[PDB]
Amino acid sequence: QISVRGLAGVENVTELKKNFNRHLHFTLVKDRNVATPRDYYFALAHTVRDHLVGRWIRTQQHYYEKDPKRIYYLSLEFYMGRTLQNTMVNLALENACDEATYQLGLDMEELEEIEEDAGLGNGGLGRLAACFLDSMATLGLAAYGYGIRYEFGIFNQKICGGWQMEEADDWLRYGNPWEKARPEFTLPVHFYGRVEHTSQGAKWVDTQVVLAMPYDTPVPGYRNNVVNTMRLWSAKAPNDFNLGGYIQAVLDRNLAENISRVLYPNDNFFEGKELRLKQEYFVVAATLQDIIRRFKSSNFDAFPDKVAIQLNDTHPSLAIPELMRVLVDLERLDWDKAWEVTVKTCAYTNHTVLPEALERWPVHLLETLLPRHLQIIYEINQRFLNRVAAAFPGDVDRLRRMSLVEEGAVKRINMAHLCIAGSHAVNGVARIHSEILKKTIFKDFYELEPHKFQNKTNGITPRRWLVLCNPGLAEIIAERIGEEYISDLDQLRKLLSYVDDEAFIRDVAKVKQENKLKFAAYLEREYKVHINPNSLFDVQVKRIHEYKRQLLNCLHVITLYNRIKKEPNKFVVPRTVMIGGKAAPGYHMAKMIIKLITAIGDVVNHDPVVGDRLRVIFLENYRVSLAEKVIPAADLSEQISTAGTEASGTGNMKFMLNGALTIGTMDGANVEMAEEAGEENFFIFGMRVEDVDRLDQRGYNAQEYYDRIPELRQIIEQLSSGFFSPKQPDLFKDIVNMLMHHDRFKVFADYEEYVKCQERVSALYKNPREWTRMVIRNIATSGKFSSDRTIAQYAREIWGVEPSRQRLPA
Amino acid sequence: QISVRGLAGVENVTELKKNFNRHLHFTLVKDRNVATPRDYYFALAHTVRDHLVGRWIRTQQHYYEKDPKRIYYLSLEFYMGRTLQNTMVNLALENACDEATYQLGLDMEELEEIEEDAGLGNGGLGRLAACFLDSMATLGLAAYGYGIRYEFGIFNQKICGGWQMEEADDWLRYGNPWEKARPEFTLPVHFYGRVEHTSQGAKWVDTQVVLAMPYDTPVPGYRNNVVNTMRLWSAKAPNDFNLGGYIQAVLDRNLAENISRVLYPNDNFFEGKELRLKQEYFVVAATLQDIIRRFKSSNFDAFPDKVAIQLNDTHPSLAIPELMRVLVDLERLDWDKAWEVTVKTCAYTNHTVLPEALERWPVHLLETLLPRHLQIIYEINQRFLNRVAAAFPGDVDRLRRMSLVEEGAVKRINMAHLCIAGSHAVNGVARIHSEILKKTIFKDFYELEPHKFQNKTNGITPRRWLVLCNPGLAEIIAERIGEEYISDLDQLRKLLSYVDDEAFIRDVAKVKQENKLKFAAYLEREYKVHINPNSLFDVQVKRIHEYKRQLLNCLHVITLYNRIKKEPNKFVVPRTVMIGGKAAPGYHMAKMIIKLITAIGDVVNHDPVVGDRLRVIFLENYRVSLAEKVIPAADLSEQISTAGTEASGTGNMKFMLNGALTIGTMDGANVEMAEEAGEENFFIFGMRVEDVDRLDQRGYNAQEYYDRIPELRQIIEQLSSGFFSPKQPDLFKDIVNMLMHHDRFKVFADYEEYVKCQERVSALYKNPREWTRMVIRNIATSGKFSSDRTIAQYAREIWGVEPSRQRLPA
Numbered sequence A, B: 001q002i003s004v005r006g007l008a009g010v011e012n013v014t015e016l017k018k019n020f021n022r023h024l025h026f027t028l029v030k031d032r033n034v035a036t037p038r039d040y041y042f043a044l045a046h047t048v049r050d051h052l053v054g055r056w057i058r059t060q061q062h063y064y065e066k067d068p069k070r071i072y073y074l075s076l077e078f079y080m081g082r083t084l085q086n087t088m089v090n091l092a093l094e095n096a097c098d099e100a101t102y103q104l105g106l107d108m109e110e111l112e113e114i115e116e117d118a119g120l121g122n123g124g125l126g127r128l129a130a131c132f133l134d135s136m137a138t139l140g141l142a143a144y145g146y147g148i149r150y151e152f153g154i155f156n157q158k159i160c161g162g163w164q165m166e167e168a169d170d171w172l173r174y175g176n177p178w179e180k181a182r183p184e185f186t187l188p189v190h191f192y193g194r195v196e197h198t199s200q201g202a203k204w205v206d207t208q209v210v211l212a213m214p215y216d217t218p219v220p221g222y223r224n225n226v227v228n229t230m231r232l233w234s235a236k237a238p239n240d241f242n243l244g245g246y247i248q249a250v251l252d253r254n255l256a257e258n259i260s261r262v263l264y265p266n267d268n269f270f271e272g273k274e275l276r277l278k279q280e281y282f283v284v285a286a287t288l289q290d291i292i293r294r295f296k297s298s299n300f301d302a303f304p305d306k307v308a309i310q311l312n313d314t315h316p317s318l319a320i321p322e323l324m325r326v327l328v329d330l331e332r333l334d335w336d337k338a339w340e341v342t343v344k345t346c347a348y349t350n351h352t353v354l355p356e357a358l359e360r361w362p363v364h365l366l367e368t369l370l371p372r373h374l375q376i377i378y379e380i381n382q383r384f385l386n387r388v389a390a391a392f393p394g395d396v397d398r399l400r401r402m403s404l405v406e407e408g409a410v411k412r413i414n415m416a417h418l419c420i421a422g423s424h425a426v427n428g429v430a431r432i433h434s435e436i437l438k439k440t441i442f443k444d445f446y447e448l449e450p451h452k453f454q455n456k457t458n459g460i461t462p463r464r465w466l467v468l469c470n471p472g473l474a475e476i477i478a479e480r481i482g483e484e485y486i487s488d489l490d491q492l493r494k495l496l497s498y499v500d501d502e503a504f505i506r507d508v509a510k511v512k513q514e515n516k517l518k519f520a521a522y523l524e525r526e527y528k529v530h531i532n533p534n535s536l537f538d539v540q541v542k543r544i545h546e547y548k549r550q551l552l553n554c555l556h557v558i559t560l561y562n563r564i565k566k567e568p569n570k571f572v573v574p575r576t577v578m579i580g581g582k583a584a585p586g587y588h589m590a591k592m593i594i595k596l597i598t599a600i601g602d603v604v605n606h607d608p609v610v611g612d613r614l615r616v617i618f619l620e621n622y623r624v625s626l627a628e629k630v631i632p633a634a635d636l637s638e639q640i641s642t643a644g645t646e647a648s649g650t651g652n653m654k655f656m657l658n659g660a661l662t663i664g665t666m667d668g669a670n671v672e673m674a675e676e677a678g679e680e681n682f683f684i685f686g687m688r689v690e691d692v693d694r695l696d697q698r699g700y701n702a703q704e705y706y707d708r709i710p711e712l713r714q715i716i717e718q719l720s721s722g723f724f725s726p727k728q729p730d731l732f733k734d735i736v737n738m739l740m741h742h743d744r745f746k747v748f749a750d751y752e753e754y755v756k757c758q759e760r761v762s763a764l765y766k767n768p769r770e771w772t773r774m775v776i777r778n779i780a781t782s783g784k785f786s787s788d789r790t791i792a793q794y795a796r797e798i799w800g801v802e803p804s805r806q807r808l809p810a
């Protein structure tokens, strides 16, 4: 049908058809009288997977022969979503499979909806890891992603009575056709025990053993025949473990296997729980044995020429002392040589500045669980502080500020300090964030070792986030400029020379309109909710946090409703305001915010005076597959974190590539997006970081804003008095109380400017031609935000390897 | 190579070769530079499995069209062993696969050794269920086996320092290529809760839900293209289950899933544990919903014309009140109609007379776990006792003896009484056992309803237990009489006309000798133990229990050793005495017996005066795959249970078919085996049941035997004084104490007769020609003990269906 979806050759279609039927018969053990749509999904997935395996085997054989430097990307999260369509896109099989399935009497899009998301992440950090694997394969890098195969990923969110309920994401129930278990590469991981000192060094003894069993998933590059590996570890008990007496010993195997059972869902709070520490060590210990095994199967001097380890946040920070443990205790290298190798091998990426998100593990936990690692960490700390003392003699406060060990009620290890000390490179994830790291939280470290600190601005993969989710847009672009932009996104700049082309203008606008009609239909079908597709689609989707300021959005919504009720017969640009995202199960304020959003909906959506001029919908169970549907349909992207709090953002980039305009603060990557597009083509408002700092020095007093802005006061009274919760008038007192007396994120301070900026958005939307021309200018300048650019910078400036765009042979 | 292994056609071999390579590449994702023998095993298994699926689908389609009466065989145990070779045998593929693998440079026998046993049973009862599925498929019956998919089967036994150690049988670690998960047929099972009475009957409410997920395994008939199904249920938690708070609720899913985690290993003790009761209900509740679903998908009057349920012991006895619950509570049939349907549908097989093996569940357990079932059981009991009262008025002791409810300290339900009341047929498993049921333990029930009581003498499948494990023997037989005996074992009688044929005599003896050389080699390779293959192979393999009298065997062994030490230069027929079997983890005396056997070995095997005239070996980890190796190699089968204690035995039959002579008591099926072969061709000794009864009336006094038999006294002194345990002289005091003062199984009373009978065995073994002629007479009369005869009798006399030997089309 559409050109970017590839060829539908007679030979190809015929062969796909017979392989589909083979799998249905031999693999699924069904015939067509009993097969359900789920059976048909699986037959398709196995058919497509078969096309991967030859390339997968020859890619890994290629790396064995050429022995390139290998990149190991360590992450506790890989937020992959669905795999079927992505695989078809990257292998150029989408149209052939569409034809083959059509001829079998089946609708491929319907089969695609059956696949479960691989929801092995919380949000931004997890999805970045996924985008990165796609780009590393596409750029021909010999890269491996290593993590944990959680039996249960991020919980499925149900809304009951306006409240979030969590249920288990049993994503493996029907089986996962993409993974291959590799029980033959199982490895032991040690916990607890104690340290003995001998003449021939330290020995870690009397440990409990848990086994790490790997499962490999293929990661295909875009049409280059490269297929890389994501290896996820699963926890297994040894067979003499514990060995009711007998029955109970068998049942207690669960204790060990609980390590890989569930993803921690609390993504900007740190909870120092033992089970999470076990997960962190488990991934690190198994991965490093795997790395070393592969290195020996080609003298540790050359280890950093053959190995790069990238730490995604501090979550795998124990790689540093584990590498030291292996090198010193097992391989018998002297300390200084081992340290040199470790530093040259490891690099650390930081993803936040909020102090409550930093990992600080209690010493008593490490002491019991990982006694040898604690000793190594103390030794690292001592030698590190000796260097600080020599560089800044007499500066005793610097010594206590830079220490890896934090003193206090409970002593803790600062894992961020450990990562800086033991890495040759440290990067933030957007320019403003990387500057903040150097100026504030890691200032002392930057003065000691300025050469370590870098920026690598985040990106997204244009395969999933344009070709896959928005084929209509990818096609009209391809018509004008060809297909090469899909792996070289900077070529979208050529679209500037069509900003005055009346045909293109009409087509960009038509694609958006079709995407919106499609999504409005999805809403009615799967959620019995009825929206006006001529309204402006105003969308804020991301995890629920106070710093992301969903509450500021809420205040605007209520202002609109109040203005309509005041002058009901005045014209306003109609809006559908959509907000979605998950709240961490323990985060009370985030749960109250969800309830507020649904409560506003209850009032606004049933007020006959409003009509269909304003609708407020809470988008349930936001996740990767829902993002792929809502983002192509959006007109306005809400990116409104308090300046200095969102390290980068990546949702922002998705919306820009897909033809929405952005209203946002000068925070994270928003700054670079506005710089690329031009500030005239962005709806920027609010305090900059400098303004927030000045307000903090003075003291933030929310009462001042309440006293001087009558529209704001009216909303606060409505919240307080039970306007949005008639049967429980005090339901939202916690929210009011927070806003009035302890708002760390200064919601009121940006209110006026935000409401004014929103009026300008509405004004532009009334002129469809100029809206669409501004959109073209955004899409055209979105090229910098491809993850291929990001990974190319990691490769050259951190890992010391050259990317390659050349096909491997098929 | 050998004819019974089928054709090796050029077309077949070529096609197997390419399918093997396909699976290695696409299924296992390997190439031949990295493949291990385990990879090659899996490629073979998938290749053979492909040949099943077409027949499996068309068999089940055939049953849908013809709608025959369906047989449901309910068992908590299915002791299947390995599947690969059995599948090849039954499909006539063994020689083709042997050729195909040879041409690929691989040894098929070596690949066969990689497969794990499916050890989902303890011993006799579990293996009977397995033999039965094979025979039901071979006889064209529309039969389904239903049980539990235990994650851990019977423990692997290691011997450390002469002691049994148990380790977990993690049989699914590498995956099971034979099963197909069917998550789409998942069913809810209810526990706990309470009963509400309404106007419209009782309702069971506030229950906890566990999900039952089925896994289907194919059961192929012998060369008839029938493939039946064994459906095993796996326990899964629902996704709102419980829903740390969040983390802990996810981890607590283990509680529900523990139902299918592990097989109870205690096979002639009853332990009233809650987890076992959950297993019993779980299998019954899921199975019955499945049965009813299938019945509706063609008025419950016709239910018993379309459904037979066979209860393998009392373990699935809750089928009776569950069927009543469904019919009365959910389908709204009146009680009397429901009861009629239930009785006509269910039949019960009893497997023992030992009182400590009978299931008697505490009322308080049923009360909490299954409150509605308890009510139904009380109601059944009340109506049943009203019938007893009417038939035997005034007989008040009969009323208390026959009651399903046992009074006492704790009230219990007698599940055997429940099964008799609710079944139209009750059978024992050998003639003597079935007579004992009528005369003693179920006398009262037989007087009330004599028509219910039947005999069905056990059997074994000649596919696994001759063709598969002893191809050499199957071939020399086939040469003389053709192949038809494999599915009509009575044809072995034709071998009587070769008892004087000198060629046949030499061939029978040569096959035994080759089997023995092969096993002696297996011993050295896998266990560093060196035996003389010219000795008589004296074998006792079965679970370790006092009633099976491994101790009597021990006493004989020590007598032989003592006679040699007394007259060392006298000639004796050399022996290798092999004893093997698992002890239940809690059964202290059984564990002491294993230690005694190894201790005797320690002394006997290293005494230079004995030389290689006597060896005592404990066969470690006895299980189905080990039986297949040792049984073909045996000369003498030890079947020496105290008369009246072994209900049937089936090991006995295996040895008879494979060319060993039997020394045994007149117990279980030994009686019928001697009757078939002729008592002159059997080494019978010891008390009969009548003699045991007379001794009990008088009072068994072991001291009398010790006082009158000097050779026995010497052994007891040796045990007592530390002869077999020098460093711990009192190690075996418990054993001596038991033998002298509370031996329920009268070991001393059969000692003299046993030792004398053993001398006659030795005398015959000195004349190789006459030994072999007696063997021929055993093999020739083993036909009655085919499980095809057994199942044909169940089919006609219990289930009301005709067996069929006709091929389905391929």
Ligand SMILES: O=C(/C=C/c1ccc(-c2ccccc2)cc1)N[C@@H]1O[C@H](CO)[C@@H](O)[C@H](O)[C@H]1O
Residues within 6 Å of the ligand: A122, A123, A124, A125, A126, A128, A264, A266, A267, A268, A269, A270, A271, A276, A315, A351, A352, A357, A359, A429, A458, A646, A647, A648, A649, A650, A668
């Ligand atoms: O998603 C995250 C952080 C997730 C996270 C997840 C888990 C944990 C955690 C740590 C310890 C124990 C339990 C949970 C801590 C943090 N950060 C986002 O990373 C994106 C990619 O760089 C940025 O675009 C966002 O600005 C940043 O907030």
Ligand SMILES: O=C(/C=C/c1ccc(-c2ccccc2)cc1)N[C@@H]1O[C@H](CO)[C@@H](O)[C@H](O)[C@H]1O
Residues within 6 Å of the ligand: B122, B123, B124, B125, B126, B128, B264, B266, B267, B268, B269, B270, B271, B276, B315, B351, B352, B357, B359, B429, B458, B646, B647, B648, B649, B650, B668
């Ligand atoms: O194997 C068994 C009994 C096994 C068994 C297994 C499990 C349990 C059990 C029951 C409740 C709770 C836990 C365990 C009770 C008994 N019996 C043998 O059955 C054979 C087949 O009929 C006969 O040949 C043997 O004579 C008989 O002992």
